Design a protein around this ligand. Structure first.
Ligand code: NA
Lengths: 236, 225, 229, 237
């Protein structure tokens, strides 16, 4: 177990895939995890249950990370239960791949609001809530697409490129008060194209999850404004 | 510089950097289309200035953030000129504030005006330049700047994705990232850049001289980054 | 304690500063540390002793990392004592800042040989020795006014490490880099975190990149500079 | 393109990319100095070709890896032309090997020929251009230097080093308006398994690289220093 001065963590879009592993990983290292879900209570509750059965601390929380007012409410709820919030992971993300010539503005906004605006709101709240205690760490989960572009993903790459850039700006603003901001850019993660990956396999959600954890942990305390690639050598 | 193409649309071309891009490109033989959003007088004075020097220039009102306006404007150009070879996404605003003071509206305002606008422009470029299997497109960039850095980081990333999508049809996409441009201690060249210095880098990236260059970001900042 | 599938680690220039902390940190997480020194046996022995007195596993080993033949001999020695080598840290490094117009070729080579060539040799040997067992991780510890030679050697190291990452990838030998900033107030003013880093903070990022935790990470550079770049 | 400066030295200018840089720059009115190491005939044939078209050109023998040879050669140019406004460090060799097969001598061979050579050139450019408070210098590197490569631990090292080093030079020349920049070519026509990963779906010409070098030297890029310009057809973004 990595070392955490903080006690709890909010993970957006934590119901499944990468968000679910981040919750597992961080729970296994002694943090109380808050598992944000948007729609399905049963999946999120089953995850919470699974973690409790292993002796870890976990809770579920319903909101839409793209909604300003839902995100503010959800933080107020956490501060009320736990006394504060030390850690945050902006993971909420959707895709809507189309060739640009076919893509409508609505398709572009849809991904921008759900991926970038959501991270802006989360990061803003983190700064509000973590400044009081002069301690925090935030990780934005982004993608290789945000660094290198992709055919059919003008909107995804825009939202991830934006997230990466934005996170650095936050890093500047949280720095004096020891609130760190960093990004992670997964490559191809399980859940053909393996040939272009030097490690010659897909990454697990776990491998991403453990890099997020490092960046939240005290081990990375002189690290802020960095992007950590977790892509098997696909992009260097 | 050499241009296979014949004309260019520049968004936010009334003044500052956009205006210099128009001058520069007009003096190198391209017919420039000068998009303005609000002030007709400044745009028409620019058009006039360029005409009086024997260059070819036109003016066009539309809001680059508006999908339907951008599509109409291109239709207008295609109708006058037969097509469009070059495009410069320059439309851009700032609204600096510390993130804790910043409202969602402040964030969207910059996103829609800077990033969404470049998306639309790029999309239309692709539609209109594919037919003729030729084009070049330049996306111009612009503590307290979470919204600006988001929109510009996004633009840079998005442009690369466009570069992928235009590549087979020889439609290049590239970015320029100006530093402090005239409207110093941390700038190695120890001076502000002129709008002209930005404008000539745009021109290179549109010119045939940069024909093996796509998906790139060109910094024009005096060594500041 | 972070998770290590591997058992031992060689650290070049481990006598003092950052190299010494990498040794302490990794020793405390259960790895047998090999403490390379070039000249002073006493300081290196005192470190080894300190770590053994705490119940950790540690050894010292004399060689010049810039020397091809010395480095090969030393690895042979390790393989022979421990059965193999799972981890390596190229930390051997010098500076010789001067303005380029005053800098001689000898000044440039001096830094290149001691920083870049040394890392090449270490990385090459890592690949030879780790390929048999299809497991390993390697960390290279890496512009500016007055530092044409340093930036050259560090830019090179960073680029070279990626090439290594390609070559070790099929055999699950990962290569990564770390780029410390100012490590222990007018220097501090340009650092967003507004303080110097400790050797520990660098040492723990190295450890992560060696640990199983970073197993899908290769060819990456990890900045440990407090937001300075 | 517009050049305030009047002449240019290009290292390894006999052939390939270096030759095209010379042709390009000659056709835009610069007096070009064509460095060669070994073969006089090829360099002379290039000079001849350019003179027959009414351009200004000279040949100059030296090894860019040798400090003393490079100093002499600049002294020669200053003596003929009054100064030197532009420089292109292009001298470069390859010696690909898998690292486990590579000897230290193989590593140095590329470092000395590619990186040390650029360091010397850049150093001299600074000495010779400072007096007149004007200059531009381009280090021709490679995509390999940005992304690394299987079998090119020594090439990448030397190009990664170049790109980093050039920025340091940019800092040191900035007050005196001496700009330093790099170019990183991708796969350039070498005399369809390479081509499939290139979005533009073709190899670049030596010309397309040559014209990017020219831009970076030209007055058109006067607010650009410490930058790396990729000329790789989208292969790396
Ligand atoms: Na061309």
């Amino acid at each position: 177990a990595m070392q955490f001065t903080g006690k709890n963590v909010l993970i957006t879009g934590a119901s499944k895939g990468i968000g679910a592993e981040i919750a597992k990983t961080l729970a296994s290292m002694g943090l109380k995890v808050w598992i944000n879900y948007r729609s399905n209570a049963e999946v999120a509750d089953a995850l919470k249950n699974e973690l409790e059965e292993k002796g870890y601390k976990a809770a579920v929380i319903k909101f839409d990370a793209a909604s300003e007012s839902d995100f503010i409410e959800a933080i107020q709820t956490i501060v009320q239960s736990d006394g504060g919030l030390s850690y945050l992971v902006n993971n909420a993300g959707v895709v809507r791949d189309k060739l640009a010539i076919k893509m409508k503005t609505e398709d572009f906004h849809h991904v921008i609001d759900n991926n970038l605006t959501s991270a802006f709101i989360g990061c803003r709240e983190a700064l509000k809530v973590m400044s009081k205690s002069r301690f925090g760490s935030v990780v934005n989960v982004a993608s290789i697409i945000g660094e290198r572009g992709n055919m059919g993903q003008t909107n995804y790459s825009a939202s991830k490129g934006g997230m990466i850039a934005m996170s650095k700006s936050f890093a500047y603003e949280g720095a004096l008060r020891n609130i760190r901001f960093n990004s992670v850019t997964p490559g191809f993660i399980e859940t053909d194209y393996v040939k272009n990956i030097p490690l010659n396999r897909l990454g697990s959600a776990k491998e991403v999850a453990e890099a997020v954890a490092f960046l939240l942990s005290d081990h990375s305390s002189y690290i802020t404004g960095e992007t950590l690639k977790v892509n098997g050598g696909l992009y260097m």
